Amino acid sequence: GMKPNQFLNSSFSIINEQIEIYERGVTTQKVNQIPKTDDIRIQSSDKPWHWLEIPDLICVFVDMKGSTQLSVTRQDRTMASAYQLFTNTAIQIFHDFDTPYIDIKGDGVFALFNSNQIYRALAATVTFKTFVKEVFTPKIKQKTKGIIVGGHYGIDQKTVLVRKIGLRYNEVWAGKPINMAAKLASLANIDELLVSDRYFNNLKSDFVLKSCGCSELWLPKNVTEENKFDFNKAYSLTSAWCPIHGRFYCQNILNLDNA
Amino acid sequence: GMKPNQFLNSSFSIINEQIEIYERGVTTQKVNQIPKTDDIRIQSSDKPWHWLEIPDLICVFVDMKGSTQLSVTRQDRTMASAYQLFTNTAIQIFHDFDTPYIDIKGDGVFALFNSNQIYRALAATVTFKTFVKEVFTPKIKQKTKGIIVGGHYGIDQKTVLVRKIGLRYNEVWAGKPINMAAKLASLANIDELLVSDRYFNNLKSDFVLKSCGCSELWLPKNVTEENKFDFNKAYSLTSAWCPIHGRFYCQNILNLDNA
Ligand SMILES: [Cl-]
Ligand SMILES: [Cl-]
Ligand SMILES: [Zn+2]
Ligand SMILES: [Zn+2]
């Protein structure tokens, strides 16, 4: 129902071009793991959009929480320092866990994992969560003389589509889990990880379901009235790596993907 | 703080490296407009992080709303087509409005504008909003035989910091307006734009404050109890370009930045 006098001429022409592209339909092809970036082809502009379908991809999203009083303009520039200590550490930790794909969005970082990296994704997320709780929050509190800033985290797992868009070219991701992992992180309290029920249902080991004894780690949370999610239930983890047993637990959990 | 038995050895070493970087402090320098990407220098890794301070930068964030039933796996693959029709049109429209910087995050797109592009940012946002209402929503409803999918939108304006991080290199943005524009969009209803009070307070012309008569366009909304924003009030726009007067209004609004 678009009319010429409703839009700029250029906008009108662009919208009609996008309508034509949309009317071409799509094609897809299955690829079991996140492909190398150069294996994602740039298409000729006349073709129907082609997507690669990655099954049961895991998306972790971590975001700074409680930072509204941190500043980029006042003398201490504390938001700049906090951004580095939070985001750069997130990136380096996810890289150390051999994350297939990392990207930065606002005050947050998302990390994509393959469907056979369930436990690796969790171990990387809990490592970052523990860093934030034990290091980031105390140091920012020291610098600000009292402000408590931390993180909150979400994980979802679902099939996604990927292709490249030129703005160079970047991967673009269509589907549920990146959007849903970010929405879960936004819903989470400070120092809380929320995961979807479909991701939680893939966690089977007592190394991740029960504490070290220093109890059930995960609590269900109904998310239906949020009107944001295509699943009924999330699961909440508020604990972190044990100061005594955390390394041993992380070692075992990482190995759980190899079986 | 950190204990060695709480983390993997590699994670421990990485955290200590990030603490050292954080303890170097930061330096900043003012640049009045969003710089060219090659003017944002890559630093040697030993230096305190340097940031460019861009005053009163405008961030628009547009996001798909109501898409939980769209699928990337069922036969119609409707989420793939919808992603193209929504996101690619957003990209092309923002490029047509000469947006200095565009980036894609999940089901959404953000566009950054200079402080002297107040009205251009609004005109680009309302153009995309009108496209979504008049074109995207009807076509997706037709394809799905009834599902109503649309968009929601946020705008904030505040000083930001920018530098480059290598994961070639990408700009990273620290500060309020990208995070806050995304949170405003998440808070917005379908076919609703929410803007911060500080952005709204820069809107002075009746071309943006009053309708063509086919009334006040903006309604205040208190956002204090959201505990997410560093401002008290947002402003809601639910209208779109008039089917008769929309081109004329958009043209005049664009001209408002040149005075
Ligand atoms: Cl600030
Ligand atoms: Cl889906
Ligand atoms: Zn223990
Ligand atoms: Zn009118």
Residue numbers in the entry:
A (entry chain A), B (entry chain B): 0 to 166, 177 to 223, 233 to 277
What does the report in the manuscript say about this coordinate set?
3’,5’-cyclic uridine monophosphate (cUMP) and 3’,5’-cyclic cytidine monophosphate (cCMP) have been established as bacterial second messengers in the phage defense system, named pyrimidine cyclase system for anti-phage resistance (Pycsar). In this study, we aimed to structurally, and functionally characterize both cUMP- and cCMP-synthesizing PycC and cUMP receptor PycTIR.
The crystal structure of AnPycC was subsequently determined to 1.8-Å resolution. AnPycC contains two nearly identical polypeptides with an r.m.s.d. of 0.13 Å for 259 Cα pairs, two chloride ions (Cl−), two zinc ions (Zn2+), two acetate groups, and two glycerol molecules in the asymmetric units. AnPycC forms a tight, head-to-tail homodimer with catalytic centers located at the dimerization interface, with a buried surface area of approximately 3,700 Å2. Notably, these four zinc-binding residues are highly conserved among the clade D PycC cyclases, but not clade A, B, C, and E PycC cyclases. Notably, AnPycC has an additional C-terminal α-helix α9, named zinc-binding ribbon, which further interacts with α4 and the N-terminus of the opposing protomer.
